[PDB]
Design a protein around this nucleic acid. Sequence first.
RNA 1: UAAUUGCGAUAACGAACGAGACCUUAACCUACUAAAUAGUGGUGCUAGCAUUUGCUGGUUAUCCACUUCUUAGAGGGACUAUCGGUUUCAAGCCGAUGGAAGUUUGAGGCAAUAACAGGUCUGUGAUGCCCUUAGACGUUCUGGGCCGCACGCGCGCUACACUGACGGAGCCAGCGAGUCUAACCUUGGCCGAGAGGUCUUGGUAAUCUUGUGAAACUCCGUCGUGCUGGGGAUAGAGCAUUGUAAUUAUUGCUCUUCAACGAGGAAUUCCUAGUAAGCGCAAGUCAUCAGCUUGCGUUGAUUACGUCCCUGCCCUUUGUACACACC
Lengths: 206, 69, 145, 56, 143, 56, 141, 101, 63, 63
Amino acid sequence: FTPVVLATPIPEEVQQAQTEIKLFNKWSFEEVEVKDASLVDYVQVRQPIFVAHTAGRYANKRFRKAQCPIIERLTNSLMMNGRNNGKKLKAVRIIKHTLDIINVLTDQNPIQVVVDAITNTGPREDTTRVGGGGAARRQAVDVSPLRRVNQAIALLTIGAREAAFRNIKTIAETLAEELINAAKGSSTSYAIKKKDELERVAKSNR
Amino acid sequence: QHAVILDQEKYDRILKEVPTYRYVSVSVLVDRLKIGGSLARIALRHLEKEGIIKPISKHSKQAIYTRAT
Amino acid sequence: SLVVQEQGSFQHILRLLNTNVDGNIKIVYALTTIKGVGRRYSNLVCKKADVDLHKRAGELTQEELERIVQIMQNPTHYKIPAWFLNRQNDITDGKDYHTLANNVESKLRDDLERLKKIRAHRGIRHFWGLRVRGQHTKTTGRRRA
Amino acid sequence: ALISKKRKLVADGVFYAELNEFFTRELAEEGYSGVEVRVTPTKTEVIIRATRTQDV
Amino acid sequence: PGVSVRDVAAQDFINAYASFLQRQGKLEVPGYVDIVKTSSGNEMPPQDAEGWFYKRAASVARHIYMRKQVGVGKLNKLYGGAKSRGVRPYKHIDASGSINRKVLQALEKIGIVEISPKGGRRISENGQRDLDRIAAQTLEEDE
Amino acid sequence: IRRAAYGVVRYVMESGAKGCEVVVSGKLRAARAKAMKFADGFLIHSGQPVNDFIDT
Amino acid sequence: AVPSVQTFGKKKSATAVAHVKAGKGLIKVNGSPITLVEPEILRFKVYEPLLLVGLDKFSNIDIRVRVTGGGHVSQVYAIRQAIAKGLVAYHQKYVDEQSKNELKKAFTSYDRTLLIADSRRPEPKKFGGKGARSRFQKSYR
Amino acid sequence: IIKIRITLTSTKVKQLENVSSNIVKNAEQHNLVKKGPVRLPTKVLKISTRKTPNGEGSKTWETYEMRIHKRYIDLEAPVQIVKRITQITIEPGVDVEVVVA
Amino acid sequence: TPVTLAKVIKVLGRTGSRGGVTQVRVEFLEDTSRTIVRNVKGPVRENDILVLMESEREARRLR
Amino acid sequence: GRVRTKTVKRASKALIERYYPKLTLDFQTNKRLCDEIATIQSKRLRNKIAGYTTHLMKRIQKG
RNA sequence: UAAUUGCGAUAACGAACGAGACCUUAACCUACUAAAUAGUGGUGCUAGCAUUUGCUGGUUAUCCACUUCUUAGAGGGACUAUCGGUUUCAAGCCGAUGGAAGUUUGAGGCAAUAACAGGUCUGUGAUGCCCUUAGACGUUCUGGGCCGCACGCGCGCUACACUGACGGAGCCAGCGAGUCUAACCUUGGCCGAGAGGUCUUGGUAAUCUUGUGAAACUCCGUCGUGCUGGGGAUAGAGCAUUGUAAUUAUUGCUCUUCAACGAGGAAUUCCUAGUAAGCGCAAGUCAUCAGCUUGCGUUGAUUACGUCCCUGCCCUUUGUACACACC
């Protein structure tokens, strides 16, 4: 490549590794594949970024929320349970750790692990309390793709927090185990469990 | 319900069973073997020092050790 | 690292100052099971005994234990400054006294009965069993048990 | 004096307020309306505004 | 190439100068080092009770070499945090000014800083060449 | 009340303002206060025109 | 002699006053280099124009950027778009519209608004609430 | 010729810049180096108060900004010019001050 | 279960009692002659891809 | 919504009534022409009036 | 349509108010005016490294110029501009580009006719009528009281910890306020473990406090899931400041005491984007005392861009045995 030297001392791991191919800090958003063609153009993995801490403008129309690079929406739902509202630097730190741990536990592309988990884990029906008149009847309903990826992101992060809450096994570890056992149909990860529950109650109530 | 001091027996169990893993952190160490965390971090410093495992991502909140080979 | 694999120098829960102490935790928090010493006082007395705090309380045997208890109950002989103590001027004697395990609650009763035979307002509200600092009662501490 | 401009301008507003209620009670029989203040060094002025200055 | 302390990172250079004054062994530390909390915002003494004062001297050296001059109210309002002051909410908290003044006495008697015109105490020539040599050490240790 | 405020409104209207109203609140004839609102011409109530185009 | 430009970078309440002169490739922030900016994450987020466009774009220019206002996050955002639009105005004035449009289309095909300071400013606190929209709890009984 | 500084304050902007226009007119006339006059950021005295007597629910509040304008001009002139531009250039509503050193 | 793919033809309008279930006509992505009305939960744009657990429900307006 | 009011719409109506041999299909021409020809009290309302005049002439050229 | 906003249609035609418009404040401006009461560039003088020609700094003004940022007088700028679609082929909306911004650009000030037996006679030397007026229902003073405590309710703070606590270490704001016949804000120097006290400066304030070096934050670590180093009420002992006086701990500091609480039911509160939510500051209060409110920044989201199902609100129709008007 012949990386350039200059009056500034910047390392070749900064420049030559990441100039001319702008992957990520490592583990590219390039050569990536979505499994099912219902997450195509609802999950913007078409462009690589470096850090999911971009000052998002994306709720300010209806559907621009779909064009956040999905690491952003993962780390943006990572800031819940009240006392961790607005702690975005810690949230991106946790995402970096759990992707490194995904890299350790599986030599596959961690972003591929995450997006394939989203595909495997998004609930594809819903039950909805409809009144009509009387005593709270339920109805099955199909789900929007964007609502599906909404529900899936929420499920993965929720299972991560509630598992690692009183437990010494840290949040990156539990999130990565959720990602592995969500990528595979393990039925040992919470989000796969709840996908089974909602689709089961839809199958009952339809 | 964990341990808090060494015995040279669980020490050798670390010496054998940590290279069986390819992912090492204090919490997975004290979940598999029986340590109270702080001694696991002492063990992680020792297994970084005498190279038996591989730090890839050290952070004061969280260290990620892995298989050397 | 700092790993030590001794089996016999360590042992579990021991006893100091008429109180059993779990030795499976470190010293400056381990001594705080003694009702009368705290984190701050245990910190400073282990610093004045010069014991390394990277070890737990099961080891660090009897001679250093006498070092601990003597420096604990003789503060002016081991140059703890006076304000650090827990019963400072102590009306009946004038000399200072860092009170400890049983004597903290014994002298607590002694000062209570001291000013209650005096029949001051504080001892009156103690014997009446209500809140003593000049605070509101009419809403909190209900169902006080 | 040696008073900061905040306190001075608040004092001037207070001054106008107090004169206005004073003349409002005094010259109400006359047909009084208001006060203009001409703050000048060397003998400042107060412009009383009424309707019947022939009786003021 | 000519190195300043703005050329070197924070925590690295601080730890380096802390161990530097440990290796030099002259600081005129107080005799009560294990006692003072350094701030009422604290709840425990500095639990690295052997190099905290070397490290705080390194901190005030770095923080004076980046700035013009200081006295003590700067230092107290800086290093003091927010006290867990009870069931009442937190606030901002003054620190221990006495450890700060003893630090500044130490740095003058070494020849780090001097008391300065236009008030305050500014860094002197021996302190500046000192910090330059030590920042050079920290950036030359990189194999 | 009615004759007096009519005279007032008639005077200011012929004196050349574009709008005037006079509210007399309080106890008229009986022991229960009733307002009277005397207006001729047109008046604005809305924004900054009210401040720089109305005395009250 | 001595070509120069000073530009700016702002976000919510931060101001970095950028300055690009001709030089040798010495980049700095408050005298410190930009590789010491310590939110520890956004090192690459402030390298972002350089890692985007290349470092040979820094052939013979040196930078100084100064910060006041605006927290930690928004002040390193001030640093990054200061250095970005400063290099942009440099390629306006001292080289041509071709390379200026190359750089501007680089930043706007990577439109993270390095060419417009982002214009969302806070809202004032109001009564009824400890914030701008929200209210207290009301009791009703 | 004396290194003087006039400083002006008011709460009426039209009249304030009118006074400033008149002083800058005379300074342009008598050709002094004058340090072209300086806007200062306003002192905006807010008195936020309840909108009620007696105390009463729905607990509103109004605000009452006043704003205060301050300006200064920096001149060099002989004593005749000084007293001239001091005491022929006055106008109600604006406070003037002169400082000599 | 042979899951059904689908593709949006056109929305009709959010119905249901509380309003939060849209109705969309979709084509089965392999049979362009067969489009079908279908209740959807979240937000649905045009021309995107639906998944179905069955194809022969075609439920109605909800109140 | 961008529904203008009658204190814009009648003004622009009468303005194209009595100045048709001016006032082309360019907003900036129309705004400067409004600032010279009209009696306006405020920049923002003037911008509104000229925009609606521009829209009217734009409908005039088509019919 | 945010709208009795408009396009229109028509026994109505012209209008007035209301919305709007207007006014503040936030954003954008390489464009004029200028800024030792703000910056910047250069020059000296000088610290230090590298030495190579460079860099980091100081340097009240050593001294010269400029206004990018701060500022604010003057303005400009947006009109939904341009384009496609959509519609009686209008008012409008929807999407894309452009730009500082396209929900009325945001957010406010203002906001009508008619009403309430809504609050205030205790803000008022604003007032009526009843009442009292010298052992007073006037003052004034010394204590007490409003702070009492089986209990029911409203608002909030701290929390139930590892996304955590603790300890180093980095260290970043905006609104403000501040003393002439007073002790206001305090930099700084000393002493104190701390609270604070001293010696004295600066400042009537863009200067001095002040970049208020705020908190959260983030790095390097101690702790290991244990009501434990979480939580920190209770409670004792001492030490100070404010005040004529501090007990019915004023409040602050130092040690010790470690309670209930393991994310909390039926119910129910607030919010659509720099927003909620977390995070502290300044002010009103003040001799001290904020856990409150009034406003400021710091970090900054998930989710719907809908509906009339519930709480209600506007217009029309229909119905009434209601008019104090469904209580």
